[PDB]
Design an enzyme around this catalytic site. Structure first.
Site, PDB file in Angstrom:
ATOM      1  N   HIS A   1     -13.908  -9.315 -17.802  1.00  0.00           N
ATOM      2  CA  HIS A   1     -14.383  -8.225 -16.894  1.00  0.00           C
ATOM      3  C   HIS A   1     -15.726  -8.598 -16.364  1.00  0.00           C
ATOM      4  CE1 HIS A   1     -15.495  -4.304 -15.346  1.00  0.00           C
ATOM      5  NE2 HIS A   1     -16.265  -3.973 -16.364  1.00  0.00           N
TER       6      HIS A   1
ATOM      7  N   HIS B   1     -18.714  -6.977 -15.203  1.00  0.00           N
ATOM      8  CA  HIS B   1     -19.128  -5.618 -15.445  1.00  0.00           C
ATOM      9  C   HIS B   1     -20.099  -5.126 -14.343  1.00  0.00           C
ATOM     10  CE1 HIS B   1     -20.355  -2.184 -18.224  1.00  0.00           C
ATOM     11  NE2 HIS B   1     -21.101  -2.076 -17.113  1.00  0.00           N
TER      12      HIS B   1
ATOM     13  N   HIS C   1     -17.799 -10.379 -19.732  1.00  0.00           N
ATOM     14  CA  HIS C   1     -17.445 -10.454 -21.130  1.00  0.00           C
ATOM     15  C   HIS C   1     -15.996 -10.427 -21.272  1.00  0.00           C
ATOM     16  CE1 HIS C   1     -16.733  -5.935 -21.283  1.00  0.00           C
ATOM     17  NE2 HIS C   1     -17.847  -5.857 -20.557  1.00  0.00           N
TER      18      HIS C   1
ATOM     19  N   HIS D   1     -12.611  -8.751 -22.107  1.00  0.00           N
ATOM     20  CA  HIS D   1     -12.188  -7.362 -22.166  1.00  0.00           C
ATOM     21  C   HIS D   1     -10.768  -7.350 -22.778  1.00  0.00           C
ATOM     22  CE1 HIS D   1     -12.172  -3.084 -21.433  1.00  0.00           C
ATOM     23  NE2 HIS D   1     -13.244  -3.103 -20.663  1.00  0.00           N
TER      24      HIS D   1
ATOM     25  N   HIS E   1     -22.378   7.889 -27.980  1.00  0.00           N
ATOM     26  CA  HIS E   1     -21.426   6.922 -27.422  1.00  0.00           C
ATOM     27  C   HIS E   1     -21.746   6.675 -25.932  1.00  0.00           C
ATOM     28  CE1 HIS E   1     -18.816   7.541 -30.862  1.00  0.00           C
ATOM     29  NE2 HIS E   1     -19.008   8.854 -30.734  1.00  0.00           N
TER      30      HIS E   1
ATOM     31  N   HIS F   1     -18.498   4.083 -20.018  1.00  0.00           N
ATOM     32  CA  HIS F   1     -18.588   3.253 -18.835  1.00  0.00           C
ATOM     33  C   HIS F   1     -17.377   3.593 -17.959  1.00  0.00           C
ATOM     34  CE1 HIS F   1     -18.746  -0.127 -16.166  1.00  0.00           C
ATOM     35  NE2 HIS F   1     -17.833  -0.840 -16.799  1.00  0.00           N
TER      36      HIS F   1
ATOM     37  N   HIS G   1     -15.221   1.946 -14.904  1.00  0.00           N
ATOM     38  CA  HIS G   1     -14.960   0.745 -14.036  1.00  0.00           C
ATOM     39  C   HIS G   1     -14.773   1.147 -12.548  1.00  0.00           C
ATOM     40  CE1 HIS G   1     -13.728  -2.304 -17.289  1.00  0.00           C
ATOM     41  NE2 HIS G   1     -14.147  -1.234 -17.944  1.00  0.00           N
TER      42      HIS G   1
ATOM     43  N   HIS H   1     -14.330   4.488 -20.706  1.00  0.00           N
ATOM     44  CA  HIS H   1     -14.252   4.378 -22.165  1.00  0.00           C
ATOM     45  C   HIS H   1     -15.615   4.126 -22.808  1.00  0.00           C
ATOM     46  CE1 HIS H   1     -15.120   0.037 -22.169  1.00  0.00           C
ATOM     47  NE2 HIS H   1     -14.388   0.033 -21.050  1.00  0.00           N
ATOM     48  N   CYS H   2     -15.665   4.387 -24.142  1.00  0.00           N
ATOM     49  CA  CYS H   2     -16.902   4.139 -24.907  1.00  0.00           C
ATOM     50  C   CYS H   2     -17.140   2.630 -24.940  1.00  0.00           C
ATOM     51  CB  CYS H   2     -16.784   4.758 -26.280  1.00  0.00           C
ATOM     52  SG  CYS H   2     -18.374   4.351 -27.159  1.00  0.00           S
ATOM     53  N   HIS H   3     -18.376   2.149 -24.618  1.00  0.00           N
ATOM     54  CA  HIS H   3     -18.587   0.721 -24.578  1.00  0.00           C
ATOM     55  C   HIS H   3     -19.102   0.145 -25.940  1.00  0.00           C
ATOM     56  CE1 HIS H   3     -19.040  -3.238 -22.687  1.00  0.00           C
ATOM     57  NE2 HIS H   3     -18.895  -2.756 -21.453  1.00  0.00           N
ATOM     58  N   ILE H   4     -19.142   0.971 -26.978  1.00  0.00           N
ATOM     59  CA  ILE H   4     -19.205   0.410 -28.358  1.00  0.00           C
ATOM     60  C   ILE H   4     -17.772  -0.170 -28.559  1.00  0.00           C
ATOM     61  CG2 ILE H   4     -19.335   1.001 -30.826  1.00  0.00           C
ATOM     62  CD1 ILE H   4     -21.194   3.423 -29.768  1.00  0.00           C
TER      63      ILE H   4
ATOM     64  N   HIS I   1     -15.237   1.074 -31.041  1.00  0.00           N
ATOM     65  CA  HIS I   1     -14.622   2.399 -30.760  1.00  0.00           C
ATOM     66  C   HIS I   1     -13.526   2.283 -29.705  1.00  0.00           C
ATOM     67  CE1 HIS I   1     -18.677   4.375 -32.146  1.00  0.00           C
ATOM     68  NE2 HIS I   1     -18.026   3.777 -33.139  1.00  0.00           N
TER      69      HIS I   1
ATOM     70  N   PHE J   1     -10.783   4.894 -28.040  1.00  0.00           N
ATOM     71  CA  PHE J   1     -11.711   5.817 -27.366  1.00  0.00           C
ATOM     72  C   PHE J   1     -11.812   5.453 -25.873  1.00  0.00           C
ATOM     73  CE2 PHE J   1     -16.067   8.203 -28.299  1.00  0.00           C
ATOM     74  CZ  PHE J   1     -15.460   9.412 -27.981  1.00  0.00           C
TER      75      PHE J   1
HETATM   76 CU    CU Z   1     -18.372   5.150 -29.197  1.00  0.00          CU
HETATM   77 CU    CU Z   2     -18.685  -4.052 -19.761  1.00  0.00          CU
HETATM   78 CU    CU Z   3     -17.041  -2.424 -16.553  1.00  0.00          CU
HETATM   79 CU    CU Z   4     -14.309  -1.583 -19.894  1.00  0.00          CU
END
Ligand code: CU
Ligand code: CU
Ligand code: CU
Ligand code: CU
Ligand SMILES: *[C@@H]1O[C@H](CO)[C@@H](O[C@@H]2O[C@H](CO)[C@@H](O)[C@H](O)[C@H]2NC(C)=O)[C@H](O)[C@H]1NC(C)=O
Ligand SMILES: *[C@@H]1O[C@H](CO)[C@@H](O[C@@H]2O[C@H](CO)[C@@H](O)[C@H](O)[C@H]2NC(C)=O)[C@H](O)[C@H]1NC(C)=O
Length: 496
Positions: free
Chosen positions: A64, A66, A109, A111, A394, A397, A399, A449-452, A455, A460
């Site tokens: 991805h 980002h 990164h 994905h 949390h 993000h 997209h 979605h949560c970017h941790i 999770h 998540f």
């Molecule tokens: Cu999270």
């Molecule tokens: Cu990202």
């Molecule tokens: Cu992204």
């Molecule tokens: Cu993502």
């Protein structure tokens, strides 16, 4: 320093960024992964050649980019089983896309699953030759990119499901509790010059409270959105966020500590952990012995604004949009939920489901996790924090979009007139009701979605299936993309 047309060869090998050796993921034979750059409007052609042989960190991959909108190129966005099937080992796949109207700091990164935590993650800078802030600095180049990352001595699938970091890495270097003599990163400045530092979080989990002893930071960009300049003495950066800040190197020639305190794991700087070195030309090649002073002017997100002072989409009242959604978080059976559903990756990527004739959210898999959005409209989404979703705050993000943060964490007020816009936002602590607005100007399925990363792995996430009737016509796919799913589905499990 490479790009915008480049090969990115992905492989496995040993690395020791904190002086502990472990297998990880290399990109073009280096760790941390290399910086990619281009200019506003360029076409990027990044040929991802997957040569990984380690199934525990996954042999397959998907990338991805980002922060990039990907309009007309939703097939290139990256997320596995949403926008593509993964690239299989021994194969390559060309991401070919353009970046009209964007310039700032980004990153790439893996994905696929929690693979980026094992080391596939690097910074991207898209320079603007007419940057509105160019006259605030003298130096902006490979040596003013600063990355922050979490590092673990056990691999993502080897340690605990939500592990605690053994070290913070700054530009790929840092110390752990057992490697107190490991090399620290050095960022060099010349007294009298002004620098555009581009700070990017590559973290899988912790947020960092970032400061530099003796120096203020003038923030001018957040997540690739230009800001009015706003000077602070510290800032908190959540996973996947970016800030540009100008540092004026006008202090005495010396070494000064660059600090990045995580919100979990080792929360002090004993022995130089969580740190790197700001070195003025002429200073001794030694550690700083400077002292942290208490931050009395920290970044506050509700105080940031865009350079243009852009209003939020829609009308200035709650629900003042074409479609308002609320995402109710929870957690049960070791899975996160949103509105009662946990995301599991479907076997047919969401984009391919739409290309193959899926018409509604009810048709799309995974069931309960996909939201249809109307075309050319305004949308408002509230993401209220709750202790029922452990591991807050949390950072969510979206997209394919930038969004206006009409309400930030730690604030009780709504700002429709001139809020910051960005693309990753902390949803804060129980009692917050972080609320975003965006415009549906970009047909395709887009992850929210949560970017941790641990999770997301635990479910998540939801998918925004934006303007379903126009997805296919707007995003014509290359035949190399159409060949990803049959190649992947033919793998046996041990080769995934
Ligand atoms: Cu999270
Ligand atoms: Cu990202
Ligand atoms: Cu992204
Ligand atoms: Cu993502
Ligand atoms: C594949 O990658 C994994 C994860 O990095 C490597 O796992 C290591 O396994 C050894 C032997 O069991 C353990 O002592 C180490 O703690 C593991 N490392 C990590 C970072 O978790 C595995 O060695 C790699 N395979 C090969 C052939 O190198
Ligand atoms: C977070 O804000 C959302 C949006 O304002 C709140 O959900 C709205 O709540 C009101 C009062 O029940 C309803 O009239 C609306 O229908 C809701 N809107 C949506 C789109 O569902 C939500 O209650 C807030 N949560 C907290 C904890 O303050």
């Amino acid at each position: 320093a490479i790009g915008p047309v480049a090969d990115l060869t992905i492989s496995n090998g040993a690395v020791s960024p904190d002086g502990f050796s472990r297998q990880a993921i290399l990109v073009n034979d280096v760790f941390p992964s290399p910086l990619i750059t281009g200019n506003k409007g360029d076409r990027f052609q990044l040929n991802v050649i997957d040569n990984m042989t380690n199934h525990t960190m996954l042999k397959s991959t998907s990338i991805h980019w980002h922060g990039f909108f990907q309009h007309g190129t939703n097939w290139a966005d990256g997320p596995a089983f949403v926008n593509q099937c993964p690239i299989s080992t021994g194969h390559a796949f060309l991401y070919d896309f353009q970046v009209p109207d964007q310039a700032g700091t980004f990153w790439y990164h893996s994905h696929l699953s929690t693979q980026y935590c094992d080391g596939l993650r690097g910074p991207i800078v898209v320079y603007d030759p007419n940057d509105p802030h160019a006259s605030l600095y003298d130096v902006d180049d490979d040596s003013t990119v600063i990355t922050l990352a979490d590092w673990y001595h056990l691999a993502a699938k080897v340690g605990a499901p939500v592990p605690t970091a053994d070290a913070t890495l700054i530009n790929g270097l840092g110390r752990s509790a057992a490697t107190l003599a490991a090399d620290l990163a050095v960022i060099t400045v010349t007294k009298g010059k002004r620098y555009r530092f581009r700070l990017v979080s590559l973290s899988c989990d912790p947020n960092y409270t970032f400061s530099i002893d003796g120096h203020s930071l003038t923030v001018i960009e957040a997540d690739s959105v230009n800001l009015k300049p706003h000077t602070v003495d510290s800032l908190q950066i959540f996973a996947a966020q970016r800030y540009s800040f100008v540092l004026n190197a006008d202090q005495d020639v010396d070494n000064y500590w660059i600090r990045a305190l995580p919100n979990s794991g080792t929360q002090n700087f004993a022995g130089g952990t969580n740190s790197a070195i700001l070195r003025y030309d002429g200073a001794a090649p030694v550690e700083p012995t400077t002292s942290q002073t208490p931050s009395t002017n920290p970044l506050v997100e509700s105080a940031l604004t865009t350079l243009k002072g852009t209003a939020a989409p829609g009308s200035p009242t709650p629900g003042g949009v074409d479609l308002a959604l609320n995402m109710a978080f929870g957690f049960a059976g070791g899975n996160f939920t949103i509105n009662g559903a946990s995301f599991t990756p479907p076997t047919v990527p969401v984009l391919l489901q739409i290309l193959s004739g899926a018409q509604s959210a009810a048709d799309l898999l995974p069931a309960g996790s996909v939201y249809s959005l109307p075309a050319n409209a305004d949308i408002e989404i509230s993401l209220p924090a709750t202790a029922a979703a452990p591991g807050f705050p949390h950072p969510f993000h979206l997209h394919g979009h930038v969004f206006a943060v009409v309400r930030s964490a730690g604030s009780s007020t709504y700002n429709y007139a001139n809020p910051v816009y960005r693309d990753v936002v902390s949803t804060g602590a129980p009692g917050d009701n972080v609320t975003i607005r965006f415009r549906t100007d970009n047909p395709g399925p887009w992850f929210l979605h949560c970017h941790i990363d641990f999770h997301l792995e635990a479910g998540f996430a939801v998918v925004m299936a934006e303007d379903i009737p126009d997805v296919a016509a707007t995003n014509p796919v290359p035949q190399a993309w159409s060949d990803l799913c049959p190649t992947y589905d033919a793998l046996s499990p041990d080769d995934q």
